[PDB]
């Protein structure tokens, strides 16, 4: 695995929180299968006042088989498999987005990229992945109200390949930076299969 990438659109408007905000997302490889754990330092995000949301972003060649939340609850079956299932509406807590199923409109893969990682001032590398069409699934959880470190654990089967980008994104649905965009942070790592 590569070294950790972290970016955010957090700017001067957030005082001595700007850098804690930038570094809140981290990803660590754990183990024909890939397993990794995502940690969100929600400390300075004020989620308990007005909630946030998180995003898990998966590449081509990986298929989520298991996802466990910070309460060690297996929430895999909570996510839609059809993006147009009525259980996938904007109100719902667990949402799923897929490039195969659509790119544009509110539940479209590109729209959700734009509203998640796109907003986290992604470096050139993260943008290569999106632009090089190397990513295909987004898993989303609304209503994050925690104020501590949340850890999720994800397992996925390698369906195809050597390069495996893993991304995660957290943001506020209310607090914005100085250009009026939701404060949004990202962490990513490249896993290479030798
Ligand atoms: O990304 C998950 C959310 O998608 C929709 O909101 C998006 C976007 O994230 C938000 O920042 C923007 O203000 O509006 C978009 C839709 O018009 C849902 O509204 C959210 O509840 C989440 O599902």
PDB file of C-alpha atoms and ligand atoms in Angstrom:
ATOM      1  CA  UNK A   1       0.000   0.000   0.000  1.00  0.00           C
ATOM      2  CA  UNK A   2       0.993   3.600  -0.878  1.00  0.00           C
ATOM      3  CA  UNK A   3       1.344   6.439   1.632  1.00  0.00           C
ATOM      4  CA  UNK A   4      -1.922   8.076   2.776  1.00  0.00           C
ATOM      5  CA  UNK A   5      -3.475  10.851   0.674  1.00  0.00           C
ATOM      6  CA  UNK A   6      -5.588  13.507   2.513  1.00  0.00           C
ATOM      7  CA  UNK A   7      -7.229  16.649   1.174  1.00  0.00           C
ATOM      8  CA  UNK A   8     -10.064  19.037   2.071  1.00  0.00           C
ATOM      9  CA  UNK A   9     -11.799  22.208   0.906  1.00  0.00           C
ATOM     10  CA  UNK A  10     -11.467  23.557   4.435  1.00  0.00           C
ATOM     11  CA  UNK A  11      -9.871  27.006   4.377  1.00  0.00           C
ATOM     12  CA  UNK A  12      -9.149  30.072   6.533  1.00  0.00           C
ATOM     13  CA  UNK A  13     -12.809  30.257   7.557  1.00  0.00           C
ATOM     14  CA  UNK A  14     -12.290  27.434  10.075  1.00  0.00           C
ATOM     15  CA  UNK A  15      -9.460  28.867  12.167  1.00  0.00           C
ATOM     16  CA  UNK A  16      -7.298  26.436  14.112  1.00  0.00           C
ATOM     17  CA  UNK A  17      -9.556  23.599  12.905  1.00  0.00           C
ATOM     18  CA  UNK A  18      -8.485  23.844   9.238  1.00  0.00           C
ATOM     19  CA  UNK A  19      -5.677  21.303   9.516  1.00  0.00           C
ATOM     20  CA  UNK A  20      -7.479  18.888  11.907  1.00  0.00           C
ATOM     21  CA  UNK A  21     -10.299  19.006   9.352  1.00  0.00           C
ATOM     22  CA  UNK A  22      -7.946  18.175   6.495  1.00  0.00           C
ATOM     23  CA  UNK A  23      -6.508  15.120   8.162  1.00  0.00           C
ATOM     24  CA  UNK A  24      -9.689  13.526   9.516  1.00  0.00           C
ATOM     25  CA  UNK A  25     -10.008  10.628   6.971  1.00  0.00           C
ATOM     26  CA  UNK A  26      -7.603   7.693   7.026  1.00  0.00           C
ATOM     27  CA  UNK A  27      -7.432   4.280   5.372  1.00  0.00           C
ATOM     28  CA  UNK A  28      -5.476   1.218   6.422  1.00  0.00           C
ATOM     29  CA  UNK A  29      -5.078  -2.085   4.602  1.00  0.00           C
ATOM     30  CA  UNK A  30      -5.854  -5.063   6.852  1.00  0.00           C
ATOM     31  CA  UNK A  31      -5.455  -8.211   4.716  1.00  0.00           C
ATOM     32  CA  UNK A  32      -8.469 -13.331  -3.440  1.00  0.00           C
ATOM     33  CA  UNK A  33      -9.796 -10.563  -1.262  1.00  0.00           C
ATOM     34  CA  UNK A  34      -9.137  -7.067   0.032  1.00  0.00           C
ATOM     35  CA  UNK A  35     -10.073  -5.833   3.488  1.00  0.00           C
ATOM     36  CA  UNK A  36      -9.476  -2.340   4.802  1.00  0.00           C
ATOM     37  CA  UNK A  37     -10.637  -0.080   7.587  1.00  0.00           C
ATOM     38  CA  UNK A  38     -11.787   3.523   7.390  1.00  0.00           C
ATOM     39  CA  UNK A  39     -11.453   5.938  10.307  1.00  0.00           C
ATOM     40  CA  UNK A  40     -13.293   9.280  10.516  1.00  0.00           C
ATOM     41  CA  UNK A  41     -12.134  11.731  13.178  1.00  0.00           C
ATOM     42  CA  UNK A  42     -15.459  13.540  13.603  1.00  0.00           C
ATOM     43  CA  UNK A  43     -14.038  15.622  16.537  1.00  0.00           C
ATOM     44  CA  UNK A  44     -14.229  19.123  15.098  1.00  0.00           C
ATOM     45  CA  UNK A  45     -17.003  18.511  12.658  1.00  0.00           C
ATOM     46  CA  UNK A  46     -19.892  19.654  14.877  1.00  0.00           C
ATOM     47  CA  UNK A  47     -22.005  16.659  13.715  1.00  0.00           C
ATOM     48  CA  UNK A  48     -23.894  16.607  17.025  1.00  0.00           C
ATOM     49  CA  UNK A  49     -25.296  20.073  16.247  1.00  0.00           C
ATOM     50  CA  UNK A  50     -26.102  19.497  12.564  1.00  0.00           C
ATOM     51  CA  UNK A  51     -25.374  16.090  11.043  1.00  0.00           C
ATOM     52  CA  UNK A  52     -22.911  15.025   8.407  1.00  0.00           C
ATOM     53  CA  UNK A  53     -22.450  12.096   6.039  1.00  0.00           C
ATOM     54  CA  UNK A  54     -19.750   9.679   4.935  1.00  0.00           C
ATOM     55  CA  UNK A  55     -18.785   8.022   1.621  1.00  0.00           C
ATOM     56  CA  UNK A  56     -16.963   4.829   0.712  1.00  0.00           C
ATOM     57  CA  UNK A  57     -15.652   4.694  -2.849  1.00  0.00           C
ATOM     58  CA  UNK A  58     -14.661   1.435  -4.599  1.00  0.00           C
ATOM     59  CA  UNK A  59     -12.690   0.783  -7.808  1.00  0.00           C
ATOM     60  CA  UNK A  60     -13.397  -1.528 -10.723  1.00  0.00           C
ATOM     61  CA  UNK A  61     -12.395  -5.057  -9.870  1.00  0.00           C
ATOM     62  CA  UNK A  62     -13.610  -4.881  -6.283  1.00  0.00           C
ATOM     63  CA  UNK A  63     -16.939  -6.087  -5.016  1.00  0.00           C
ATOM     64  CA  UNK A  64     -18.094  -5.190  -1.553  1.00  0.00           C
ATOM     65  CA  UNK A  65     -18.994  -8.368   0.250  1.00  0.00           C
ATOM     66  CA  UNK A  66     -18.988  -7.030   3.826  1.00  0.00           C
ATOM     67  CA  UNK A  67     -19.200  -3.623   5.546  1.00  0.00           C
ATOM     68  CA  UNK A  68     -19.224  -3.193   9.340  1.00  0.00           C
ATOM     69  CA  UNK A  69     -19.888   0.189  11.031  1.00  0.00           C
ATOM     70  CA  UNK A  70     -18.353   1.740  14.136  1.00  0.00           C
ATOM     71  CA  UNK A  71     -20.821  -0.192  16.376  1.00  0.00           C
ATOM     72  CA  UNK A  72     -19.499  -3.393  14.800  1.00  0.00           C
ATOM     73  CA  UNK A  73     -22.822  -3.897  13.047  1.00  0.00           C
ATOM     74  CA  UNK A  74     -22.820  -5.549   9.612  1.00  0.00           C
ATOM     75  CA  UNK A  75     -24.769  -3.004   7.557  1.00  0.00           C
ATOM     76  CA  UNK A  76     -24.073  -4.584   4.120  1.00  0.00           C
ATOM     77  CA  UNK A  77     -27.711  -5.545   3.565  1.00  0.00           C
ATOM     78  CA  UNK A  78     -28.844  -1.954   4.350  1.00  0.00           C
ATOM     79  CA  UNK A  79     -27.591  -0.556   1.026  1.00  0.00           C
ATOM     80  CA  UNK A  80     -29.727  -0.717  -2.133  1.00  0.00           C
ATOM     81  CA  UNK A  81     -28.457  -2.695  -5.096  1.00  0.00           C
ATOM     82  CA  UNK A  82     -30.759  -0.834  -7.547  1.00  0.00           C
ATOM     83  CA  UNK A  83     -30.021   2.897  -7.441  1.00  0.00           C
ATOM     84  CA  UNK A  84     -33.623   3.515  -8.422  1.00  0.00           C
ATOM     85  CA  UNK A  85     -35.070   1.447  -5.614  1.00  0.00           C
ATOM     86  CA  UNK A  86     -37.369   3.668  -3.567  1.00  0.00           C
ATOM     87  CA  UNK A  87     -35.179   2.694  -0.590  1.00  0.00           C
ATOM     88  CA  UNK A  88     -32.440   4.757  -2.244  1.00  0.00           C
ATOM     89  CA  UNK A  89     -34.163   8.174  -2.140  1.00  0.00           C
ATOM     90  CA  UNK A  90     -32.436  11.333  -0.862  1.00  0.00           C
ATOM     91  CA  UNK A  91     -34.053  10.921   2.579  1.00  0.00           C
ATOM     92  CA  UNK A  92     -32.706   7.412   3.258  1.00  0.00           C
ATOM     93  CA  UNK A  93     -29.694   6.753   5.472  1.00  0.00           C
ATOM     94  CA  UNK A  94     -27.909   4.150   3.380  1.00  0.00           C
ATOM     95  CA  UNK A  95     -27.559   4.979  -0.251  1.00  0.00           C
ATOM     96  CA  UNK A  96     -25.821   3.268  -3.138  1.00  0.00           C
ATOM     97  CA  UNK A  97     -24.454   4.746  -6.379  1.00  0.00           C
ATOM     98  CA  UNK A  98     -22.995   2.852  -9.353  1.00  0.00           C
ATOM     99  CA  UNK A  99     -21.388   3.888 -12.635  1.00  0.00           C
ATOM    100  CA  UNK A 100     -23.000   0.944 -14.466  1.00  0.00           C
ATOM    101  CA  UNK A 101     -26.451   2.178 -13.467  1.00  0.00           C
ATOM    102  CA  UNK A 102     -26.104   5.879 -14.244  1.00  0.00           C
ATOM    103  CA  UNK A 103     -23.840   8.917 -14.271  1.00  0.00           C
ATOM    104  CA  UNK A 104     -26.021  11.998 -14.270  1.00  0.00           C
ATOM    105  CA  UNK A 105     -28.899  13.216 -11.988  1.00  0.00           C
ATOM    106  CA  UNK A 106     -29.115  13.139  -8.229  1.00  0.00           C
ATOM    107  CA  UNK A 107     -28.477   9.413  -7.816  1.00  0.00           C
ATOM    108  CA  UNK A 108     -25.983   9.405 -10.719  1.00  0.00           C
ATOM    109  CA  UNK A 109     -22.400   8.269 -10.171  1.00  0.00           C
ATOM    110  CA  UNK A 110     -20.841  11.489 -11.423  1.00  0.00           C
ATOM    111  CA  UNK A 111     -23.224  13.685  -9.419  1.00  0.00           C
ATOM    112  CA  UNK A 112     -22.368  11.856  -6.219  1.00  0.00           C
ATOM    113  CA  UNK A 113     -18.660  11.953  -6.998  1.00  0.00           C
ATOM    114  CA  UNK A 114     -18.990  15.719  -7.464  1.00  0.00           C
ATOM    115  CA  UNK A 115     -20.827  16.159  -4.176  1.00  0.00           C
ATOM    116  CA  UNK A 116     -18.405  13.885  -2.262  1.00  0.00           C
ATOM    117  CA  UNK A 117     -14.743  13.509  -3.271  1.00  0.00           C
ATOM    118  CA  UNK A 118     -14.930  16.214  -5.917  1.00  0.00           C
ATOM    119  CA  UNK A 119     -15.438  18.726  -3.125  1.00  0.00           C
ATOM    120  CA  UNK A 120     -12.430  17.749  -1.059  1.00  0.00           C
ATOM    121  CA  UNK A 121      -9.878  19.664  -3.173  1.00  0.00           C
ATOM    122  CA  UNK A 122      -8.686  16.278  -4.557  1.00  0.00           C
ATOM    123  CA  UNK A 123      -5.012  16.106  -5.630  1.00  0.00           C
ATOM    124  CA  UNK A 124      -4.039  15.257  -9.218  1.00  0.00           C
ATOM    125  CA  UNK A 125      -3.793  11.561  -8.261  1.00  0.00           C
ATOM    126  CA  UNK A 126      -7.338  11.228  -6.951  1.00  0.00           C
ATOM    127  CA  UNK A 127      -8.580  13.061 -10.045  1.00  0.00           C
ATOM    128  CA  UNK A 128      -6.672  10.613 -12.329  1.00  0.00           C
ATOM    129  CA  UNK A 129      -8.642   7.771 -10.764  1.00  0.00           C
ATOM    130  CA  UNK A 130     -11.977   9.459 -11.394  1.00  0.00           C
ATOM    131  CA  UNK A 131     -11.018  10.685 -14.852  1.00  0.00           C
ATOM    132  CA  UNK A 132      -9.367   7.397 -15.810  1.00  0.00           C
ATOM    133  CA  UNK A 133     -12.739   5.766 -15.079  1.00  0.00           C
ATOM    134  CA  UNK A 134     -11.067   3.503 -12.507  1.00  0.00           C
ATOM    135  CA  UNK A 135     -13.873   3.827  -9.881  1.00  0.00           C
ATOM    136  CA  UNK A 136     -17.435   2.513  -9.999  1.00  0.00           C
ATOM    137  CA  UNK A 137     -19.290   2.243  -6.681  1.00  0.00           C
ATOM    138  CA  UNK A 138     -20.199   4.710  -3.973  1.00  0.00           C
ATOM    139  CA  UNK A 139     -21.634   3.731  -0.593  1.00  0.00           C
ATOM    140  CA  UNK A 140     -23.158   6.535   1.439  1.00  0.00           C
ATOM    141  CA  UNK A 141     -24.334   6.968   5.000  1.00  0.00           C
ATOM    142  CA  UNK A 142     -26.425   9.982   6.089  1.00  0.00           C
ATOM    143  CA  UNK A 143     -27.111  11.193   9.648  1.00  0.00           C
ATOM    144  CA  UNK A 144     -23.632  11.039  11.162  1.00  0.00           C
ATOM    145  CA  UNK A 145     -23.976  12.742  14.542  1.00  0.00           C
ATOM    146  CA  UNK A 146     -20.983  11.294  16.381  1.00  0.00           C
ATOM    147  CA  UNK A 147     -18.230  13.439  17.894  1.00  0.00           C
ATOM    148  CA  UNK A 148     -15.629  10.706  18.299  1.00  0.00           C
ATOM    149  CA  UNK A 149     -13.478   8.592  15.950  1.00  0.00           C
ATOM    150  CA  UNK A 150     -15.637   6.276  13.797  1.00  0.00           C
ATOM    151  CA  UNK A 151     -14.047   3.145  12.336  1.00  0.00           C
ATOM    152  CA  UNK A 152     -15.649   1.108   9.534  1.00  0.00           C
ATOM    153  CA  UNK A 153     -14.302  -2.157   8.195  1.00  0.00           C
ATOM    154  CA  UNK A 154     -14.787  -3.153   4.565  1.00  0.00           C
ATOM    155  CA  UNK A 155     -14.179  -6.420   2.766  1.00  0.00           C
ATOM    156  CA  UNK A 156     -14.403  -6.885  -1.000  1.00  0.00           C
ATOM    157  CA  UNK A 157     -13.639  -9.660  -3.464  1.00  0.00           C
ATOM    158  CA  UNK A 158     -11.218  -9.048  -6.298  1.00  0.00           C
ATOM    159  CA  UNK A 159     -13.271  -9.775  -9.385  1.00  0.00           C
ATOM    160  CA  UNK A 160     -10.653  -9.081 -12.019  1.00  0.00           C
ATOM    161  CA  UNK A 161      -5.484  -6.628 -12.012  1.00  0.00           C
ATOM    162  CA  UNK A 162      -2.825  -4.851  -9.987  1.00  0.00           C
ATOM    163  CA  UNK A 163      -4.020  -1.321  -9.065  1.00  0.00           C
ATOM    164  CA  UNK A 164      -6.673  -0.796  -6.383  1.00  0.00           C
ATOM    165  CA  UNK A 165      -7.566   2.769  -5.328  1.00  0.00           C
ATOM    166  CA  UNK A 166      -9.479   3.029  -2.036  1.00  0.00           C
ATOM    167  CA  UNK A 167     -11.243   6.277  -1.147  1.00  0.00           C
ATOM    168  CA  UNK A 168     -13.338   7.617   1.727  1.00  0.00           C
ATOM    169  CA  UNK A 169     -15.031  10.983   2.173  1.00  0.00           C
ATOM    170  CA  UNK A 170     -16.695  12.801   5.074  1.00  0.00           C
ATOM    171  CA  UNK A 171     -18.532  16.150   5.100  1.00  0.00           C
ATOM    172  CA  UNK A 172     -20.978  18.477   6.820  1.00  0.00           C
ATOM    173  CA  UNK A 173     -24.407  19.054   5.250  1.00  0.00           C
ATOM    174  CA  UNK A 174     -24.529  22.484   6.883  1.00  0.00           C
ATOM    175  CA  UNK A 175     -21.161  24.108   7.625  1.00  0.00           C
ATOM    176  CA  UNK A 176     -19.442  25.552   4.580  1.00  0.00           C
ATOM    177  CA  UNK A 177     -15.991  26.948   3.792  1.00  0.00           C
ATOM    178  CA  UNK A 178     -15.370  30.453   2.458  1.00  0.00           C
ATOM    179  CA  UNK A 179     -16.537  29.633  -1.055  1.00  0.00           C
ATOM    180  CA  UNK A 180     -19.866  28.363   0.334  1.00  0.00           C
ATOM    181  CA  UNK A 181     -19.194  24.679  -0.307  1.00  0.00           C
ATOM    182  CA  UNK A 182     -19.961  22.081   2.369  1.00  0.00           C
ATOM    183  CA  UNK A 183     -16.818  21.425   4.378  1.00  0.00           C
ATOM    184  CA  UNK A 184     -15.622  18.182   2.807  1.00  0.00           C
ATOM    185  CA  UNK A 185     -12.632  15.932   3.548  1.00  0.00           C
ATOM    186  CA  UNK A 186     -11.083  12.909   1.894  1.00  0.00           C
ATOM    187  CA  UNK A 187      -8.551  10.158   2.521  1.00  0.00           C
ATOM    188  CA  UNK A 188      -7.177   7.662   0.006  1.00  0.00           C
ATOM    189  CA  UNK A 189      -4.513   5.013  -0.496  1.00  0.00           C
ATOM    190  CA  UNK A 190      -3.442   2.912  -3.424  1.00  0.00           C
ATOM    191  CA  UNK A 191      -3.284  -0.797  -2.828  1.00  0.00           C
ATOM    192  CA  UNK A 192      -1.025  -2.645  -5.239  1.00  0.00           C
ATOM    193  CA  UNK A 193      -1.399  -6.372  -5.743  1.00  0.00           C
ATOM    194  CA  UNK A 194       2.158  -7.585  -6.271  1.00  0.00           C
TER     195      UNK A 194
HETATM  196  O1  LIG B   1     -24.487  12.619  -1.272  1.00  0.00           O
HETATM  197  C1  LIG B   1     -25.524  12.146  -0.479  1.00  0.00           C
HETATM  198  C2  LIG B   1     -26.681  13.091  -0.448  1.00  0.00           C
HETATM  199  O2  LIG B   1     -27.176  13.308  -1.817  1.00  0.00           O
HETATM  200  C3  LIG B   1     -28.219  14.315  -1.841  1.00  0.00           C
HETATM  201  O3  LIG B   1     -27.692  15.600  -1.619  1.00  0.00           O
HETATM  202  C4  LIG B   1     -26.876  16.140  -2.672  1.00  0.00           C
HETATM  203  C5  LIG B   1     -25.623  16.681  -2.138  1.00  0.00           C
HETATM  204  O4  LIG B   1     -24.885  15.711  -1.402  1.00  0.00           O
HETATM  205  C6  LIG B   1     -25.796  17.871  -1.307  1.00  0.00           C
HETATM  206  O5  LIG B   1     -24.530  18.367  -0.843  1.00  0.00           O
HETATM  207  C7  LIG B   1     -26.502  18.927  -2.077  1.00  0.00           C
HETATM  208  O6  LIG B   1     -26.798  20.013  -1.267  1.00  0.00           O
HETATM  209  O7  LIG B   1     -27.727  18.439  -2.635  1.00  0.00           O
HETATM  210  C8  LIG B   1     -27.605  17.222  -3.425  1.00  0.00           C
HETATM  211  C9  LIG B   1     -28.907  16.878  -3.983  1.00  0.00           C
HETATM  212  O8  LIG B   1     -29.650  17.838  -4.636  1.00  0.00           O
HETATM  213  C10 LIG B   1     -29.259  14.056  -0.798  1.00  0.00           C
HETATM  214  O9  LIG B   1     -30.049  15.216  -0.671  1.00  0.00           O
HETATM  215  C11 LIG B   1     -28.673  13.825   0.511  1.00  0.00           C
HETATM  216  O10 LIG B   1     -29.701  13.639   1.492  1.00  0.00           O
HETATM  217  C12 LIG B   1     -27.735  12.712   0.529  1.00  0.00           C
HETATM  218  O11 LIG B   1     -28.420  11.527   0.155  1.00  0.00           O
END
